Amino acid sequence: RFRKICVFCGSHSGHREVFSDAAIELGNELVKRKIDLVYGGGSVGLMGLISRRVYEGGLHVLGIIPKALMPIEISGETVGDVRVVADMHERKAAMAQEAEAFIALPGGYGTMEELLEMITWSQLGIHKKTVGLLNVDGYYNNLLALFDTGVEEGFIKPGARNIVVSAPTAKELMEKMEEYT
Amino acid sequence: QRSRFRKICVFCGSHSGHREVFSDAAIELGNELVKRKIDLVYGGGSVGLMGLISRRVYEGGLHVLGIIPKALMPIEISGETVGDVRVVADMHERKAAMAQEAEAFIALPGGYGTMEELLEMITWSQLGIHKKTVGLLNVDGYYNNLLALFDTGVEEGFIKPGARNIVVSAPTAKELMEKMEEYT
State how far the Cα of A108 lies from the Cα of B167, in Å rounded to an integer.
13
Query: How many Cβ atoms from other residues are within 10 Å of residue A46's Cβ?
Result: 29
Residue B81 assigned to a binding site: no
User: B146, B158, B167: which to substitute to probe chain A, counting the most A Cβ within 10 Å?
Assistant: B158
Q: Which residues pair with B78 in a beta bridge?
A: B80
Chain B stretch 159-178, residues whose beta carbon is closer than 8 A to a beta carbon of chain A: 159, 163
Residue A47 contacts B where some CB pair is shorter than 8 Å: no
State how far the Cα of A29 lies from the Cα of A159, in Å rounded to an integer.
28
B138 three-class SS:
coil
Q: How far apart are the first and last CA of chain B?
A: 20
CB contact under 8 A, B91 and A121: yes
Q: Which domains does chain B have, with CATH numbers?
A: 1-184 (3.40.50.450)
**CB of A135 closer than 8 Å to CB of A37:** no
Residue A25 assigned to a binding site: no
Name the strand (E) or helix (H) holding B27. Answer: helix B20-35
Query: What are φ and ψ of residue A81, in 5° steps?
Result: -100, 145
State how far the Cα of B180 lies from the Cα of B184, in Å rounded to an integer.
9
Compute the 3-state secondary structure of chain A and give helix, strand, coil in percent, each to the nearest 5. 50, 20, 30
Bridge pairing between strands A4-8 and A101-104? parallel
A111 neighbourhood in chain B, CB within 8 Å: 158
Query: What are φ and ψ of residue B57, in 5° steps?
Result: -65, -50
A124 neighbourhood in chain B, CB within 8 Å: 113
Query: What are φ and ψ of residue A83, in 5° steps?
Result: -85, 130
State how far the Cα of A58 lies from the Cα of B166, in Å rounded to an integer.
41
Residue B126 contacts A where some CB pair is shorter than 8 Å: yes
Rg of chain B over all Cα atoms, to the nearest angstrom = 15
What letter represents residue B16's amino acid?
Answer: S
State how far the Cα of A115 lies from the Cα of A51, in Å rounded to an integer.
18
Residue B94 assigned to a binding site: yes
* Calculated CA dihedral for residues A85, B166, B153, B14, nearest 10 degrees: -80
Residue B163: closest C-alpha in chain A? A109
Q: Which of B72, B63, B78 is nearest to B43 (CA)?
A: B72
User: A109, A114, A161: which to substitute to probe chain B, counting the most B Cβ within 10 Å?
Assistant: A109
A12 three-class SS:
coil
Buried b (16+ CB within 10 A) or exposed e, A81-117: eeeebeebbbbbebbbebbbbbbbbbbbbbbbbbbbb
State how far the Cα of B112 lies from the Cα of A150, in Å rounded to an integer.
8
Q: Which of B139, B157, B162, B140 is nearest to B12 (CA)?
A: B139
Name, in order, each residue with C-beta under 8 angstroms of A181's C-beta and a sequence gap of 6 or more.
Answer: none
Name, in order, each residue with C-beta under 8 angstroms of A179's C-beta and a sequence gap of 6 or more.
Answer: none
C-alpha count within 13 angstroms, C-beta hemisphere, residue A145: 14
**Strand order across the B7-11 sheet:** B84-88, B64-69, B39-42, B7-11, B104-107, B133-137, B167-170
State how far the Cα of B148 lies from the Cα of A141, in Å rounded to an integer.
10
Name the strand (E) or helix (H) holding B65. Answer: strand B64-69
What letter represents residue B125's amino acid?
Answer: S
A103 three-class SS:
strand
Q: Which of A83, A85, A65 is nearest to A10 (CA)?
A: A65
Q: Which of A47, A46, A27, A13 is nearest to A171 (CA)?
A: A27
Query: How many Cβ atoms from other residues are within 10 Å of residue B100's Cβ?
Result: 11
B84 three-class SS:
strand
CB contact under 8 A, A150 and B112: yes
Residue B17 contacts A where some CB pair is shorter than 8 Å: yes
